[PDB]
Amino acid sequence: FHEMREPRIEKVVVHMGIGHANAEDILGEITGQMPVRTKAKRTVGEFDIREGDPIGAKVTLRDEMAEEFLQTALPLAELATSQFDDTGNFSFGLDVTVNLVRPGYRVAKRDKASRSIPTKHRLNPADAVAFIESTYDVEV
């Protein structure tokens, strides 16, 4: 029961919300894989009337790439309980978002007979802090 209940990292999303790009290059080095362009929506007074146009870049790491990054990434932050989502997620900062979830999360990500994960199988800030804190660092 506990085996299919113990949390895990689904994805590590590192992104730099600029506002006009050239920054892609560093993310590629700090993470290990190709970054992606970020387009914006709606016209913006702040000389941002152009809808589809580069404004940021992100990277979604999964599995090793995720941990190998967090290893030398988490030590760079001072995690606090507040910095945690209601789903058991947390982000710090260049931004670093960590998406944590239980074993059969795919049930809500597959094409056929997908289903929303029950509030019971959903992760919690509490169960989140633990898992993480239970690995190279401290909470609050």
Added chain:
RNA sequence: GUUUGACUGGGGCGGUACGCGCUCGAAAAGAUAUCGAGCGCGCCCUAUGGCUAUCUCAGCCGGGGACCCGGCGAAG
């Protein structure tokens, strides 16, 4: 030598109910008038057309009014 139209609570003036589209008037099939009420069309678009693949929107909440992550969300 002729023309100088029609509608109209008489006519003139004003207006166009003079060709079209929608709601209501309209009385739960259809049809239905007044110078009845609300208001539009005489285009625009080579994509703002067509198909396919991938995908889900407003709005609100939580975590780092532009961006990133998560949740709620049959449709506003």
